[model samples]
Target: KLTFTALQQRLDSLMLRDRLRFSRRLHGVKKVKNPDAQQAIFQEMAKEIDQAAGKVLLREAARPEITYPDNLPVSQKKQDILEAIRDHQVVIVAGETGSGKTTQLPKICMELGRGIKGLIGHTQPRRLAARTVANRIAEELKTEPGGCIGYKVRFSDHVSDNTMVKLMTDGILLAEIQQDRLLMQYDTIIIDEAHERSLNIDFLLGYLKELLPRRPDLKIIITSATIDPERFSRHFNNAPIIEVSGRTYPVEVRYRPIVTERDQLQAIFDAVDELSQESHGDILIFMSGEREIRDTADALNKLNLRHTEILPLYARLSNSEQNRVFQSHSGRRIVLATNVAETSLTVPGIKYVIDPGTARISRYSYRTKVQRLPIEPISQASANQRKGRCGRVSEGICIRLYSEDDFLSRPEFTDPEILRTNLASVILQMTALGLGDIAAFPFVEAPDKRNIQDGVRLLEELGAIAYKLTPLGRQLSQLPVDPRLARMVLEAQKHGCVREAMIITSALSIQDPRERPMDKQQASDEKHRRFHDKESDFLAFVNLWNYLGEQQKALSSNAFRRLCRTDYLNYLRVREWQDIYTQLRQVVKELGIPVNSEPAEYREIHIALLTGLLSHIGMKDADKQEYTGARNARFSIFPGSGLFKKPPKWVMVAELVETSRLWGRIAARIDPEWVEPVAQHLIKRTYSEPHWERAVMATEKVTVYGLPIVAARKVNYSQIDPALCRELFIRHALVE
Candidate 1:
């Protein structure tokens, strides 16, 4: 009755034949010449297939209540894309610059009935990109963002009952995997901008491939900007690729190559003068860093051109400085911006571009033992991204402050994060997920073995992996921040300062959020006195957070924002601090560490904070006028730190920068007595002067990761080193 021929026919005509489980199983059993094994396998799959298909059944996604767009590159050339998606579980979408690849693919997933079973998960590298891109797609579909379309980034999560499409950073997506191993929350995952090949994106891709067999119904659409689509296709077992055409609007490129530093100023003038002759609309100038933007702004202001506004945009600019860019003006504006302006900020009315084709990049080298913030030429993809900034909206002209051939000669894309980033984040997440060895993980490009080993060593040093998933390590692994910050929170839990650690950890995870505007530091500096602490820079952060807490309780949210501004704080960053604090607080709570309502004692807070700074702990020598830090590295106290004015014998620092000389920018006076206990497993203990019989002459000495904290503390020679003491006794008294 259960013949092989009958079983084969039945499985071939099944509703979910496309599923990996069904196909792989069917293929696995198909090779079995033995009828008995085939019969058993067929019966097993028959039950499984029926159960899985019932839950995974998909129907066409309903058209939006209101209607939408007709002609993005992908939209025009879309063709049977829905059929392609449904027929194959994963597909590659390659589109040229301006192909609307990022925003369009979620629609393709929705139309294929993929999201109806489970929501579609779209990921971006940048949090701002995740937020804005979600709203953009929501607008096209005429659905309110956070309703049918939703986004979640750090400090901000917006979703609703009707949410069918969810957008988030890759980190968020990766974090979700910790809870949902199957990734069951999403049926379709559109990895937007796969062409960028970020570290997290690569990790997700490799993990998703490993997850394929178990999640047979899930669909993956890897969208690239025509950046080696075939590599992805081959990686995914030759997934089908559909290419989309370029944007309808076009841009012209002009070269104004510069030979020297002085030439850049004159070149900007040259580009502006040339564009003014014929082209119209706003002029957006891309520069490398704040200093260039500052210098460029100064030079532009000198020209004093009419009907032209000069505004500089950088990631760390004050709110007032940034707000002016968005303000309506009768005058045409010249926007001096960093790389972010290309994607995050939409400086509207921009129909022209002035590309320097150079930007700043910071790279860390293990060999060099320092981070180098070198200014270099942008990649072709980044240059195209900068160029696309104008072309999509209108017929635009882009002045290349470099040569066209130079653009071509530049790397095809910027280096992926795996090569450059501190891979500890990657290592911990992978080890936590039980994803096997980091070296073997199938990143689009593999991280160097040294970075992998380096990452593992860092986690090992932080006492995370060495825990062997010590309940403590699992808690650290579960945390969404760095291991050091995670370790700080755990240490806080031990010291009854969970509330305090959350504040400083949040402050550290986020930018400091304090801005000293150029005009006001003389007394803005005076205002900072209220929150500044005498003993520790760490507690100074606590003082600010506590002050905010009291103010937040007393004032309206709007009132608090203005207070933040005049108080020299970035209100948005302050909000990020709150969100991060709350998120961490809840995570610790879930891990069974409760936050105390009452304030912690100062000693406990600093002691807890010291646990995470084993390598940063140091001894100040008055005569030396500097300090010996972790492993006896020479360090200078930063001039701006509160502790800098009065150096203590022992200190703990949170920030170390090697600016020609290693400087501890955020130091606190730590008690040397507190150091030994916190570093129990890590401290190296030795007995000195183990000579003579029963004299008890030796003193106990202790070192932590090569920084000696105790050199000559007298202790009982009887037990401290009895074996060595006995050997010494035989030589000095018994033998003589």
Candidate 2:
């Protein structure tokens, strides 16, 4: 370890170099600057740099745990676990929540190997788990554990050369496959929380299953709280199963479902109140998502109940908010949380459990090419995980909001995400990994053909795989970002809208800059419009991005927050967008693309970039609302967004589907162009088969202002080939 003196001297030398080179600029700035202003600015700068440096230093020292904690009795199961590792070369371990398998299995493998390779890689489902598990493992190992028990997550990695017990999210492992095909980096790879059956875990299990026979020295350990070991065994030709039980105490369960839709909020409140009336130490209430938690927390606060503190726990909450849930409270603590608290991280004081039996999961719609987030009952596996939380320490009761029958009706397992979601990224990665034809690959359970086709279509659009990596696909993969954002960035570059495109691409990729206010939507719209250059929300993003950069240089974080509050803006998203901008800028530079210019000059280039996204255009429907796709889905702009009620007929949307019967969201971009041929192509392809007309006839005969062209045309087309119309739309536009 280097001395602080040495570090300080290095900083001193760098500062001297900076001062000598920029002395003139510093003098010019100081000539009219207020003394305190300079001091305040410099102090803040120093603090920020120090904070960043500390974080980097901490990250550099990251490591993984190679040993286990001493509190538990591990004999038979531990021995069996060691034997499984040494013999089978691959093992599927089924353990209860506290079974110590998650923490102990890796160490068993490490010990059984006797320092053969020294590194054991463990995969967790979430970032918090990876970080906490790594930290806990480090604490057990008695070393400064950041690297030895290193954790990695999206955008941030803590793994170092010293790391032996690497805990990363399942997604990271999938990403790593792109870099290390044989995955030769570790001696033992443990896939934890397999029962959740997350798309990544399922894929990883299948991938490693096929990979194991090839890499005899590389061991695979699949751990799950309630997984069917038989299925895993069958997949691996009856691989050995090592079972371990956790040491958590007993838990009690209670059921309370809302009787009516009107009483939903009241039901949750009464449930918490009833639980509070009891003598349970600390209560954990599982809700659907952040909005529900926030609303429930606000309602609970209104009751002004004494000695009761309500904490909202979700992935989106800042670091400080998350810590408060685990902090010691005097009277009682009630945690209203999303599913993040379900499987990964364990809260220390939660003795009472209140499960609303629901979670918000992202399900992508191939038809709409958008992510549809819906709140539904948790699977039986998830329900058990929630109940397991209660039994972690002492006997605790789990209050299920729904009745026993309702619980039984819930699915035995959560749907595997790969089946229901977009597959483009997976297909791209598979191709990148030299896995030819996803359909032919021997996955444990192959993704559906329709889903695979959708993935292929999306990948084709992104040009990530031409007939293989088309020229566009190669360029897209080279981009260090999501395919969509990369497409947008490249389009902007070609269109001469490099600067505006970069700004909008960054803005759109992040959470909305517009804040969700209780009221004053009109004011918010006006504020949004102020930055909007000529009705283009994309332009507004460009202006806002530049403005935020200026603010960072001139204002403190607090001042910026205040500024956003005054303007009804989402300051957090703005900050996030700033980071996105920097990252995308670097990505662009790496690709040798220039980030400069405005939209109009790069118009053609932008449209060409938009060719792949052409499917996202909205067609003006009978109601004046622009509808996209065969669904003829109706959508309003996001509630507080400037275009809420006045969406342009032509919109280049990121997601084009109904948010509700009354509203829909489309990430604001330049005004959509009604490429006549595209519109015709959609209709022709939609009506390619006359059989689809049956579904259309129910809603087709609607009257327009003065025209009944469609009805007239249907009469004319009864005897004509629908495919001919499709060809006509593709070769010649009827109106434009």
**Every candidate's lDDT:** 0.74, 0.62
After superposing candidate 1, which stretches have Cα over 4 Å from the reference?
1-68, 145-147, 154-158, 248-250, 260-270, 289-304, 308-333, 344-349, 371-373, 392-395, 403-409, 428-440, 463-679, 688-698, 701-713, 717-736
Residue 570 lDDT in candidate 1: 61
Steric clash pairs (candidate 1): none
Q: Highest lDDT, which number?
A: 1
Question: lDDT for model 2, on a 0 to 1 scale?
Answer: 0.62
Span of ten consecutive residues with least summed lDDT in model 1: 58-67
Alpha carbon deviation, residue 108, candidate 1 (Å): 2.3
After superposition, candidate 2 runs with Cα above 4 Å error: 1-75, 114-118, 146-148, 154-160, 247-249, 260-264, 316-324, 364-371, 429-436, 450-454, 462-736
TM-score of 2: 0.60
Sliding window of 10 residues with minimal summed lDDT for model 2? 700-709
- For model 1, residues 1-736, the per-residue Cα lDDT tens digits are 3654554555433333234346666777768988887787778877776655444442223445433256645666555576778889888877665566777678777765556657788888777668777878888887775457888886345566467788898888887887667886788888877876766778889999888888887888887676678888878766898877766477888888877123336777888999998755788988765655765787788778777888887655554665567778688899988767755336767878898887656455443332333456889888888887775656789889887789889998787766775677667767766666775666766776767676666667677772255567778877756677788889887789988988887777655677777888876787787888898888888889888889988985446656866787765466656756776777888788888899898899988888777778889776958998876688889887898888898888887788778888778998888988878878888876755634556677899877778877877686776787677677777556
